[PDB]
Amino acid sequence: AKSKNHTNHNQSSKNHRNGIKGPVPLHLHNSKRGSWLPALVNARRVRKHNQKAALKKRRERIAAFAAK
């Protein structure tokens, strides 16, 4: 026998029971994979240099603190 085909009667109520959650903020999950490659490669070189600078900065802080 025939039956109901389709309806959207109760769906809005179901979606709002646990609410419609907002988006993740922009500073999270901001991966750069798939972007324009030439700019991606150049940015990798700068980040490698910055890590070496960070290590050097900590050593100087330790030596200065020990000297009081």
Partner 1 sequence: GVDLTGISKKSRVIRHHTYSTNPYIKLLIKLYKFLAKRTSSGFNKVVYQRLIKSRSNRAPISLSRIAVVMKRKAVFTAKSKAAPIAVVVGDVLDDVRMARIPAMRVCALRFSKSARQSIVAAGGECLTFDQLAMIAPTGKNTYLLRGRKSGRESVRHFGASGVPGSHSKPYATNRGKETKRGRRTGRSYKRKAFRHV
Note the residues at the interface with partner 1 (CB under 8 A): 17-18, 24, 29, 31, 33-34, 62, 65
To Mg ion, the closest distance from the beta carbon of 3 in angstroms equals 5
Q: State the DSSP string of 1-68.
A: --------SSHHHHHTTS----PPPTTSS---TTS-HHHHHHHHHHHHHHHHHHHHHHHHHHHHHHT-
Note the residues at the interface with RNA (CB under 7 A): 2-9, 12-13, 21-22, 24, 28-33, 39, 43-44, 46-47, 49-56, 58, 61
Nearer residue to partner 1 within complex by CB, 24 or 46: 24
